[PDB]
């Protein structure tokens, strides 16, 4: 308990001010009224996952009907429709190269599909196994190395070509429900269902900083564009922006009308807007500097289960349990 | 922009083919019914799944079965390859037709845990609209335990002493009064949780079964018929 007390004392000492008070001089973003430019419909069942390609145009949406649909967001044309061996898929990804798309879920197996194949179709390029729990978030590092967050309280780092668990990250007391990568792709922050988000070094394989302050299960993590901070959404309906430099909580986003936990979060390319999908069927965009609810993205008949901001910052994709994925700009 | 027009035409053709495949998949997916097979880990689940298979394959932990009754295809899945925390992977099963809840009613020590799990399933935010097919198992074991009388349910459930067999009970062949009273007490204990909330969104179907019972398929078929009949009645605005 001495180490925990010392860490708390250091965090309190470093807590010399509040982010809201410092940013009060900065003018607020006002009211944000993003509209649905495109509605990407065609999913049979609820959409559990979302990711944008590095080209900032293509989209991958995973649905518990066992469907990995690669949409062209510009034209609302399903470029690909990969059927999955396991119907219940909770994670999806784009490789940075774009030639591979990952999926996973209750099958405990991360399936990597080769999109750009010489045959002229989509096939299971790899089937990584070794996790003892459901996969909640798997994302590529360099298109030949994938970090997967599972429900066995441990994260894994696999070499796709080798197909073996090269690195294992342990220390979470609960199921990991989110996983985000720094823009430098050297450290990644994984949040478990224990109100704890741990930052792991990819090469070292051990946690460097554990962040607490949440009250319930963490369901979503996104990185700040600068890579020195990360926002976590949890079941206590409150987002928390932690700063790596301060090694403690920096900002809290909450309200009185919110009584439902966050499902997916996604920062804006500038970091001024923190987007967060909620269980109340509506997404919310917050001013990360001012902690004020900048705006609401309604329009989903069910809860917003996945939320992704494109690399170009031009649009957002909100996929809900109503088998609908909407594009906002 | 001839090349751009050709690329757009090819994109539209591929999207049309994918959409036709998706329409076929939608027909097949709506035609098939998903049944989340839940219950305490002590007993009931795997034996039922295997028996339904003998009437369809699990590799990484989820024991799936794609049995068909009459002309309707059912998908029952026993998700067993998961560590401890049903809270997070239960969310996914909010699109299933029903949750087949297998309760080892012969073991009174773990009966309270099964009741708490049933209450959590019933009162879960995402399982409000998902009906539960109660499937109290090992009725032969429960009858043998009651007839032997080694352990009394009054020790585990004091309210059983004041409980009396309901007038609407339908005793089986033989049906010793102690056995019938115990079985219907467990059924009423689960149905109290079932009726405490739901306001007509979903209903619990309390079927008693055994390990070697061959009527389980018909029970699930009739329960799914009633579930989708009520779903249509809500959809058709017939209350």
């Amino acid at each position, epitope marked *: 308990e001495q180490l925990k007390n010392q860490i708390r004392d250091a965090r309190k000492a470093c807590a010399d001010a509040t982010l809201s008070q410092i940013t009060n001089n900065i003018d607020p973003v006002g009211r944000i009224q993003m509209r649905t430019r495109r509605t990407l419909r065609g999913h049979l069942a609820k959409i559990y996952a979302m990711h944008w390609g590095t080209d900032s145009r293509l989209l991958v949406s995973a649905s518990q009907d066992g469907k990995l649909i690669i949409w062209d967001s510009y034209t609302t044309n399903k470029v690909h429709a990969i059927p999955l061996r396991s119907s219940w898929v909770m994670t999806c990804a784009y490789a940075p190269s774009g030639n591979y798309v990952a999926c996973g879920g209750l099958d405990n197996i991360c399936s990597i599909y080769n999109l750009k194949t010489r045959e002229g179709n989509v096939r299971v390029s790899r089937e990584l196994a070794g996790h003892t729990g459901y996969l909640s978030c798997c994302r590529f590092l360099d298109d030949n190395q994938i970090v997967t967050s599972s429900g066995d309280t441990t994260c894994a780092l696999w070499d796709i070509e080798t197909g073996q668990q090269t690195t294992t990250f342990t220390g979470h007391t609960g199921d990991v429900m989110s996983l985000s990568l720094a823009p430098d792709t050297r450290l990644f922050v994984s949040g478990a269902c*224990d109100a704890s988000a741990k930052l792991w070094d990819v090469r070292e394989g051990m946690c460097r900083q554990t962040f607490t302050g949440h009250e319930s299960d963490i369901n979503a993590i996104c990185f700040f564009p600068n890579g020195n901070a990360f926002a976590t959404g949890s079941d206590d309906a409150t987002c928390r922006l932690f700063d790596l430099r301060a090694d403690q909580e920096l900002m809290t986003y909450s309200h009185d009308n919110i009584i439902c936990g966050i499902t997916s979060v996604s920062f804006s390319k500038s970091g001024r807007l923190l987007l967060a999908g909620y269980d109340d069927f509506n997404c919310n965009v917050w001013d990360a500097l001012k902690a004020d609810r900048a705006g609401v993205l309604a329009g989903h008949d069910n809860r917003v289960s996945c939320l992704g901001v494109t690399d170009d910052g031009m649009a957002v994709a909100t996929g809900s349990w109503d088998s609908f994925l909407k594009i906002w700009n | 922009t001839e090349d751009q027009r050709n690329e757009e035409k090819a994109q539209r053709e591929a999207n049309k083919k994918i959409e036709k495949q998706l329409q076929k998949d939608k027909q097949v997916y709506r035609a098939t019914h998903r049944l989340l097979l839940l219950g305490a880990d002590n007993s009931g689940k795997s034996t039922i799944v295997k028996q339904m298979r003998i009437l369809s394959g699990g590799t990484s932990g989820i024991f799936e079965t794609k049995f068909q009754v009459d002309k309707v295809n059912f998908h029952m899945f026993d998700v067993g390859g998961q560590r*401890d925390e049903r*809270r997070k992977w239960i969310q996914c099963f909010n699109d299933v037709t029903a949750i087949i809840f297998v309760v080892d009613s012969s073991d009174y020590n773990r009966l*309270q845990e099964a009741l708490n799990l049933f209450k959590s399933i019933w009162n879960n935010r995402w399982l409000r609209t998902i009906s539960v097919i109660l499937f109290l198992n090992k009725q032969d074991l429960l009858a043998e335990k009651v007839l032997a009388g080694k352990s009394k349910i009054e020790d*585990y459930f004091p309210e059983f002493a004041r409980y009396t067999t309901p007038e609407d009970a339908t005793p089986e062949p033989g049906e010793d009064p102690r056995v019938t009273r115990a079985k219907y007490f467990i059924r009423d204990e689960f149905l109290r949780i079932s009726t405490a909330s739901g306001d007509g969104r979903h209903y619990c179907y309390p079927h008693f079964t055994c390990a070697v019972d061959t009527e389980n398929a018909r029970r699930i078929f009739n329960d799914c018929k009633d579930i989708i009949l009520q779903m249509n009645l809500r959809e058709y605005n017939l209350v």
Partner: nanobody, 126 residues
Framework: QVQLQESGGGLVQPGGSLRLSCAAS????????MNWVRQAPGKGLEWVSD????????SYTGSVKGRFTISRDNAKNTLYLQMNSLKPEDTAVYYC?????????????????????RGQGTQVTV
């Protein structure tokens, strides 16, 4: 940091009174449904009692339904389980389990001990 350190316990004669308390800190505690759970020596882990956010809708395991009155003080930010009677079968390690989702009526705590929103526990013997 979520903490649920338990106080009260130790050896007690059968039929005695041994009130347990939890110092629930790190969350609002005014909305989370709370539970008392017990682990017998070498025998699994069984839920004992439950109590809603407002203190009503209290329920207990039938084995201790008559005794073991549960209570919750939001202003004091604490929760107590008064054991009116004690039996040798009640000798176990008692933990306080917080419901995971705040404003929900369901509790999905863990059976084989891995739950995080749970105290270290206090051992009571008869």
């Amino acid at each position: 940091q979520v903490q649920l350190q338990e106080s009260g316990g130790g050896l007690v004669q059968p039929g005695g009174s041994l009130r347990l308390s939890c110092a629930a800190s790190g969350f609002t505690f005014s909305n989370y449904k709370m539970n008392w759970v017990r682990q017998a020596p070498g025998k699994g882990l069984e839920w004992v009692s439950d109590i809603s956010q407002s203190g009503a809708s209290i329920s207990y395991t039938g084995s201790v339904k008559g005794r073991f009155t549960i209570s919750r003080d939001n202003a004091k930010n604490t929760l107590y389980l008064q054991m009116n009677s004690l039996k040798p079968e009640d000798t176990a390690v008692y933990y306080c389990a917080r419901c995971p989702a705040p404003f929900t009526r369901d509790c999905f705590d863990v059976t084989s001990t891995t739950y995080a929103y749970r105290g270290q526990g206090t051992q009571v013997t008869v």
